[PDB]
Design a protein around this ligand. Structure first.
Ligand SMILES: [Cl-]
Ligand SMILES: [Cl-]
Length: 162
């Protein structure tokens, strides 16, 4: 198991514009396109992201290219963030994957906001961090995915994904 396979399980793959869990226009492997209600606005971002007229449909390779960019950007946003960088550096490889997954789903700012949980992770207080991460809109809106991420921080293994 690695970050790519982990997110591929959590996001799925869809080759046609669809609406995510919050109602936003998405495509490929969890690639948010626009928060706007406009499908046309979504088609527009999509063609710009791909470099061709897609008419809302992309191929497998294109989906995979967007995904690789987004994982790269997630890692780099973590490394550039004053709040996230220290947490990441302190973690083992499995747990680092779990922080990357949260960043990919909720963005850097969002994650930076879990102040208390972050401090707890840093301190390696596993059970405590798992209890605090659960008290969030995040866990309430996407509980199965949240539980998976949470198990990963609690245990340090890929168990929840196997
Ligand atoms: Cl993009
Ligand atoms: Cl879920």
């Amino acid at each position: 198991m690695n970050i790519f396979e982990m997110l591929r399980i959590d996001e799925g793959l869809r080759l046609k514009i669809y609406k995510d869990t919050e109602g936003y226009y998405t495509i490929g492997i969890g690639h948010l396109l626009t928060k706007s209600p406009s499908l046309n606005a979504a088609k527009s971002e999509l063609d710009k992201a791909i470099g061709r007229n897609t008419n809302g449909v992309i191929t497998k390779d294109e989906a995979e290219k967007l995904f690789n960019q987004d994982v790269d950007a997630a890692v780099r946003g973590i490394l550039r963030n004053a709040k996230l960088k220290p947490v990441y550096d302190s973690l083992d490889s499995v747990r680092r994957a779990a922080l990357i997954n949260m960043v990919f789903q909720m963005g850097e700012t969002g994650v930076a906001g879990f102040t208390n949980s972050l401090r707890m992770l840093q301190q390696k207080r596993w059970d405590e961090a798992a209890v605090n991460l659960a008290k969030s809109r995040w866990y309430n809106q996407t509980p199965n995915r949240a539980k998976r991420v949470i198990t990963t921080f609690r245990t340090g293994t890929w168990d929840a994904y196997k």
